[PDB]
Design a protein around this ligand. Structure first.
Ligand SMILES: NS(=O)(=O)c1nc2ccc(O)cc2s1
Ligand SMILES: NS(=O)(=O)c1nc2ccc(O)cc2s1
Ligand SMILES: NS(=O)(=O)c1nc2ccc(O)cc2s1
Lengths: 116, 115, 114
């Protein structure tokens, strides 16, 4: 999948190894090779959650399949856990948007994933 | 809802209290508690609208329901209004992408809104 | 269309003319007037692709129509070509999310396109 995290937590507070941990945990959680996983972390953002500028995160996870009720709840537990532990963001100040992408709507390497 | 604004307007030109005003106006516009509202403003961006780098904004509004023809037109009038008044961005240089999210596809507090 | 590029390539490596080239090529590829096209480039990003921090890009393209199997493959060839030539990013380290937007879900100029 592609996972993006936007947060008002300062860049200095993002630990060494964070992108690599996200990559590995996402591979494990989805049962996919890490070569497919893209991660993007955007600190120092001007944002508010519930009208408060305390630490928060707005996130997106895109995947061709592997998106659904139980799976998404599991991703949320995993990702909120990591954001709490590594960035000290409270899970109730995190939103994650999940997108189930069609293969034909995902570009890569000069084409898309619809080759049929 | 979740509202994101990306703009080439300078950070200094974003007034104090802008995030609070967005939170308040969105709460009122959608008839929802402000505790649910997330807002995100990203200034100083490298962007062009119609080939020009005069002030512009690219935005998104995500909501679980409360998205639709008439509602979106009302949101657009409101949000373009705020961007024009507060950030001095012309309404014809604003795009807003609206998304009607399923509760099962929105994560929060270690779970989703599908319980 | 609206096209967004997020990349870990440094700001200084984005050439003069890049936004304008993207604007013109997107107009040509979609047949849309350039007046409609919005482009946004975000350099110096903290990202990884396949666990590596070599140059990469995560992109999105939104359009009211003009989205589909063959068209998206054509856009990918075009855009990966530009990112490779201009930003020195390898095409196999680019992801692009395509969105076919309903006109009622796109706001502009105090209203929507519906
Ligand atoms: N099936 S998978 O390896 O998890 C992937 N899904 C997406 C979705 C969007 C996207 O831009 C990239 C990918 S990779
Ligand atoms: N029903 S509501 O309070 O307006 C909400 N909708 C969304 C959608 C996405 C999202 O990430 C967060 C929320 S809160
Ligand atoms: N028909 S078109 O000129 O290519 C456009 N489509 C969109 C979609 C979303 C959006 O935010 C803006 C535009 S312009």
């Amino acid at each position: 999948p592609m996972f993006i995290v936007n947060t008002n937590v300062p860049r200095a507070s993002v630990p060494d190894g964070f992108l690599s941990e996200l990559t590995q945990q996402l591979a494990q959680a989805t049962g996919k090779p890490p070569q497919y996983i893209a991660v993007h972390v955007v600190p120092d953002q001007l944002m508010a959650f519930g009208g408060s500028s305390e630490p928060c995160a707005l996130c997106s996870l895109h995947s061709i399949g592997k998106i659904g009720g139980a799976q998404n709840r599991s991703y949320s537990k995993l990702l909120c856990g990591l954001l709490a532990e590594r960035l000290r963001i409270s899970p109730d100040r995190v939103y994650i948007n999940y997108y189930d992408m069609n293969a034909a709507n995902v570009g890569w390497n000069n084409s898309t994933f619809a080759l049929e």
